[PDB]
């Protein structure tokens, strides 16, 4: 497959509806060797089962709020792998009130801080901690959303954090590029599932994308997964600093009129 022998660490695989799950499935299909992170001891068994499904026992805890755990992640990974060829950053969080209702109603210094700390800072932080062991042709991938580019109802403080994240893709690409490392994001369309506690229903958005996107359908984690696998691979060796929309073309229209 087109990722034969590539060693790729994936963060954020929480369930089989996780974008990271779709990415892992495509990476494994194309020949990659995988490793996984998780946060919260109650998830250790679940992530270990997912890792085994993808032929791996390489599972490590990492809360990206914690500098020591970030450093420990790579020290642990290094005991198994001399080098890292891929990193998937599929980690996002904003406090419930900061992504519901009016933008200013949910805006506080602490909500702003946490959303940017977890959703934005953590990407180049992982990249920096990984750097000593990154292969010269490594590929780093994060996930964003159209709310970084244009104001979408409720996305609010997360839209600010994602804008900073997309900027970090560009600055990382310059920093790591002379070595040969590529850095990209996928701007994914919404993925249909029941909105978890802390996230407002986005059913209306899913209906609107299905009715108005060029392809008249929502994207799947399989579609986002395949695009991710492509970007992590040498097929994409000419591509860096890119925010690739995988969203059935929805970003490119003015729908609903």
């Amino acid at each position: 497959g087109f990722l034969d022998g590539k060693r790729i660490l994936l963060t954020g695989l929480l369930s089989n509806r996780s974008i990271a799950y779709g990415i892992a499935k495509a990476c494994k299909r194309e020949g990659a060797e995988l490793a996984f992170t998780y946060v919260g001891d109650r998830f250790k068994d679940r992530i270990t089962e997912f890792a085994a499904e993808f032929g791996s026992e390489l599972v490590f805890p990492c809360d990206v709020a914690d500098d020591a755990q970030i450093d420990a992640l790579f020290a642990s990974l290094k005991t198994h792998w001399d080098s890292l060829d891929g990193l998937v950053h599929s980690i996002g969080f904003a406090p419930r009130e900061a992504i519901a209702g009016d933008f200013l109603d949910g805006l506080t210094r602490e909500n702003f801080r946490i959303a940017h700390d977890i959703s934005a800072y953590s990407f180049p932080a992982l990249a920096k901690a990984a750097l000593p062991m990154l292969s010269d042709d490594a590929s780093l991938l994060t996930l964003s959303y159209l709310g970084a580019e244009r104001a979408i109802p409720n996305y609010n403080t997360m839209g600010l954090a994602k804008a900073a994240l997309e900027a970090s893709v560009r600055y990382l690409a310059v920093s790591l590029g002379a070595k040969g490392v590529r850095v990209n994001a996928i701007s994914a369309g919404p993925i249909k599932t029941l909105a978890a506690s802390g996230i407002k229903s986005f059913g209306k958005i899913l209906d609107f994308v299905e009715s108005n996107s060029p392809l008249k359908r929502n994207v799947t984690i399989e579609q986002v997964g395949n695009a991710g696998a492509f970007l992590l691979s040498d097929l994409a060796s000419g591509v860096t600093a890119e925010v690739m929309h995988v969203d059935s073309g929805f970003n490119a229209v003015v729908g609903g009129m």
Copy 2:
């Protein structure tokens, strides 16, 4: 003038090379009534002199790192003005190492936090604290730089913060727009002066803009000031959520080839 009777609060007027100084000069010319903020008691005399130059004694301290000072600013201003018609956010800061040399070399959680706290969060924070006294047709203005859009050497962590700031312009515009309030940014070109301690020399950038921008010259605080006065005025009543480049057209070219 086109700002007759408009009451406008300006932050960030530090010296006569401050972008806020150019904005204040144009606003006063067009008939505005002004008020000013400062940070650091050693600057009280200087800002008071500037305020007097612009026909005002309305001077208030405000370190935007501090929630209590933000609230106190508007309580103080309110003892003078029933309503606020304009707000100029001309406040930026990133730690020295975070805007010099390699992006990852100067990246730390705390440097990231401070740059985003001061340069990004503080804009909608001021807007939210001001909201009860904002006139229905008020206009809020911030300042950004091309480094938010594309990777520019050394801008580094400030580029991430400015991307979040430009996103905040859009989310603020939605939040405040039904009331009638407009929210915009000027993406200013570099302003020629000796780079202060904490900021790397940008002489090469100034030379490059002078040699490669469409107008073959750097922008001035007078030019940025006039564009700012326009955006704060009813001349610009159709304009909101906009990031306006005032940069001699430099953003629109690929120069130096």
Copy 3:
């Protein structure tokens, strides 16, 4: 006013709902001296009346499909004015079928050709013919629409032409900038009026902008006019190669969800 003594030629003033009418009204208010073009002899009396309303008898015919009429326009204008300080290009046309229904249904080589010839080529063509008599600090302005940036239903072939027009703003800015001439566009929101023969009803779009734009209202020709007057003036001397949205912020959101 801020355009005192500026000599500005306006094309495309067809009726009192024309964007050019709003621009002319604001330019005259701010002290400009105006001249006007028209196409079609049956409109000579009407444009002459409009010109008189704005204190001018300088009226010239010009079908921009015709090289000879373009050259003759400036030869005629030159008999009155030594130099030209402003040019307003408010000319658009696409064949009826090319802006109604499906994009490919209305696509023919000739429809493509005419839409690009009249709506795009004519802007730098006028600029080139004017160049010998342009003042060193002249300002050239055209009008575009969000359909150049994202696919909007029915805009179709006009969206392609407007994308080429916005690109021409950038290339013109480089070409004319060393002399000191500025070149900009306003991306105007829809203007409420009965859609003329050849243009599909855009009532649904007007309703959608009123319901979803940040300012929750459609823009007016007065608002577009004032932004245009600003860009034509020395207030905007730092601004070139810019496409300025004057659209109540609508471009910056994802509405209707």
Copy 4:
């Protein structure tokens, strides 16, 4: 391979330095069945040899300036293939003077017309003529350049045409998307070769990209080819209306300062 059984027509394969050659090589590797077009009878032997290299005798003449030849192309192809799964539009032309020196110096109505006719119109024209035989999940691909987005020296009239071409990607995506057809462009970086008669030397641009792009190297036709093969494939089924940069990240920086 990931294009197993896909039937793909490629235009514009002129030499082994053609971007279409890199695309053909990657498509064949991944299992596609190919067909080819050419213009000019003196090239019949050369394109037939290239087709044979890629396991095909399906070669057809088509000057896209000519409506009858466009229709005849698909009638001919249809005698071999019931359906078409992919179309590669790798056709560009602008008259020599229109892409050398000053933008206005090389601007004429006819130069504008030809550049837009051949480089822009021809893409949706081919799509429309192909439509009856396009598979429901077909994928159409064109090639653009950063000069569509920002002013690059000499690109001039071609920059306008490419902006219209990128807009056509979006309008085509809406038109063909309900059927299930995807439409994308690759914005390719410059490809190192001796600039042919009619094209100015771009050596300085190649040096500048090598020195300033994030990856510090120019892109190759192999890299553009692999990205093209990806977009033509079901791996990219979530991607449409996209302009993907394959340019070593150069679009995302401000270089040379």
